[model samples]
Target: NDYLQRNAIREDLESYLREMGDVTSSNIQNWLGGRLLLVEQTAQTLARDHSPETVSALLEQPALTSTFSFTYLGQQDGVFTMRPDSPMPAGYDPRSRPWYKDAVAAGGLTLTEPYVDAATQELIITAATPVKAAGNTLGVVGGDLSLKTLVQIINSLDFSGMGYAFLVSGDGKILVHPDKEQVMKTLSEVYPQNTPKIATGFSEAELHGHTRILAFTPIKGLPSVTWYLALSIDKDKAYA
Candidate 1:
């Protein structure tokens, strides 16, 4: 049953992306994690004109439910201050952050290293990219995932031993994480600054030294944004 359960998550997320139609910010948000897009339409009425019966409307469009939330990297203010429901940090604004602003300014997505959350004390990986509306940069779309959870899930696999998972962004920023401590932490410390070894065109040089089963799947259709999930779990342990 556990074996099937882990596979189920992969199949489910994979299927959602495959079936997805119009790849808009709303759609990407729906699949990336669990965040609903709020939509409303209102019009003003003059004294003589009759006002619309519905003055305001609020709705919650639940696309997916999981133990995860999102935060825009490089935002001047992180998730917490921007939205009450956000579980990010206070005084964290992506707009004010250079990583976010620079990525958008460069006209593409950027990957930064993982960082420890002061509030949760957990490691997290942040992926930030720009979303366009009507051929204009509307804002940034960020995705966050817990490396601890990912590690735990992979560990549960029978043959998942002596191996790891790494999430890489289009620009070589390792987006998703397979390790908790390494979660939001990036390779910037060891690797060059903002130098991402993208998984888009992986080479044998990149695969060297990692002896295990590796899987790489791209978050397709998002040219401006892309993600790759890599698993280095030994096949024997994976099936164990």
Candidate 2:
């Protein structure tokens, strides 16, 4: 019954891993949606009453501003401002930004990848929405979120046999890894062969001169960013 023992063990591991993959995917998805939802709802409200007094009052509530690093609404005219007041350098235009364009083009609340610098925590979720009145776009409202808690939760993914996982953004950039150093690095940098696997789940990779079984899945309901969760385990540990 040695073969039976092996098969059962393999099955158990695979099933547990599958569960983790799904649970993790859903959990993270909800967590992200919660934050974006805040920005989206605020944007909608701002579109209607975006006066400086209204914006300032909304931000003072703490609940609205806690999920993001900084929040602001830029009018179509020439006005841009943010919290924790700071000087605005000359020649700076909020309309010339990627999130601004993305929010206007999407005609709704959306996520945009901007200033993705590894040295700077590797992730900045720019949630933005366009302000409209009378069938015309007036401006855009948005916020920048480094999501340190997000990194904390993602980094917490671990198991008994050293099974580990990493996060990949839509562009294949490595957002979070157990190693901590891999953040902001592209998946292609270390595993060029896995580029094709980013969009799908389940595969085998020759990691560290040995084969490993891998599975991955994307977070639901947020296709704009296309974030994915990938987990891998040793070959023998998988199904020997």
Candidate 3:
């Protein structure tokens, strides 16, 4: 049994179990569902150069407005901020969100919710963090990550045809799916109400007490972003 215990995901499993009592690793298969926004935030920040104040100043220039864009910039001054330019959707406001302001006030990182553009009908997410240089906040750096790209990542992975993958947020919103129509749907409609572990949305479900094999890896490296990756396989097929 110990032999089975030593695996790639074992450490995370133990940590997760410790953090949330009464949950076993066997119960959670697809961990990616809850962490999509965070992952996008990470990717966006990674895609940009670290400079928040400069980006903010650029956004304030009216004639040069089109050059402005939303970027999650890490600063050398110990402050993180999200800079949005003129091209932004009409109603989009960054300072209005508590997390956005709080992050800058705390001089730390911040991840925003998935913002759907009413005009273009595209879903966008932002992640911001302070870039430090010489123990000071130079500026903030961030980027606009597409939720559509996330859908592509989930669908691109080969599940070996035995199972599927999807993303569920901590709040139970399914962000991606093997089936396009199911993307962004709530877990309640995707899985049966009686489905075990559906409430948590990160754990695997059980039918008759038989164990199932599933993989859940959270997306990291976005500085202040959070996400989970859910991969599943038939237990027997996985072994084979």
Candidate 4:
């Protein structure tokens, strides 16, 4: 619900900005602190470089102190930062990243597959949408969501001591788990040949030497990304 709601607001805000005309880096900076705004013009289109001028300017902003840290990568202009000045790796390109590529491929709003953030080493996902004008792809706008906070929320859920709940990516990577070690691991790695296809309702599986019952449902508004929430409990305890 949180992800969906926030992403919807972003989508709407993007539209609002477009209708208002002439979105500038200043506009983006004022609109939201922890969001990324990137634009890449085709060879023929004329556009301004809206990437932040300095890392310090971005980092010192008040709104960036929230739960998730944010950064922006410009296709032509290097990465924008909300931290102290630092050297970016040579040849870094936002076009090459999953969030940019996935959002472009989907041609609309989408969530990236979970991956470990290089800078923070935290498992993260990006909600992104492409910026288009006159039927041309301008670039992409996105926001980062830290799995740490998400995992903490999942761990705090009341499952009545039955078992626990977690989230999984479309490709079976664990996004949120009570076991920290299992967070980024994949279902295939843990249960090689028996990884079940994710779907709604209950399914049975043997996990950690015990039979377990799992109930799962896909997250809405993220169908293309295929994120799912699952709750599992020891079968014996469930039937008791």
Counting clashing residue pairs in each candidate, in order, gives 32, 0, 42, 0
| Model 3 agreement with the true structure over 1-240: per-residue lDDT tens digits | 666655545554535433332221212222222232343344344435434454566434442223223444333333334445234356544444433454566565555556564335666654445445556545444444566655555555344454556555555566655566666766566555344243343445432344444344554433444445555445544444
Q: Which portions of model 4 miss their true places by more than 4 Å?
A: 1-67, 76-87, 192-194
Error of 3 at 60 (Å): 15
Regions of candidate 3 where Cα sits further than 4 Å from its true position:
1-92, 97-102, 105-107, 118-121, 130-141, 196-215, 221-226, 232-240
Error of 4 at 150 (Å): 1.7
lDDT of each: 0.40, 0.71, 0.46, 0.55
Full ranking by TM-score? 2, 4, 3, 1
Write the candidate numbers in order of decreasing lDDT: 2, 4, 3, 1
Considering TM-score, which of the candidate structures 1 and 3 is the better prediction for this target? 3
TM per candidate comes to 0.40, 0.80, 0.48, 0.65
The 10-residue segment with the lowest total lDDT in model 3? 21-30
Alpha carbon lDDT at 235, candidate 2: 64
> RMSD in Å for candidate 4, one decimal?
12.9
lDDT of 1 by residue, 15-86 (tens): 433222113222333443322121101001111121222111111113211323543212123321221144
Q: For candidate 1, what is the TM-score?
A: 0.40
lDDT of 1 at 65: 19
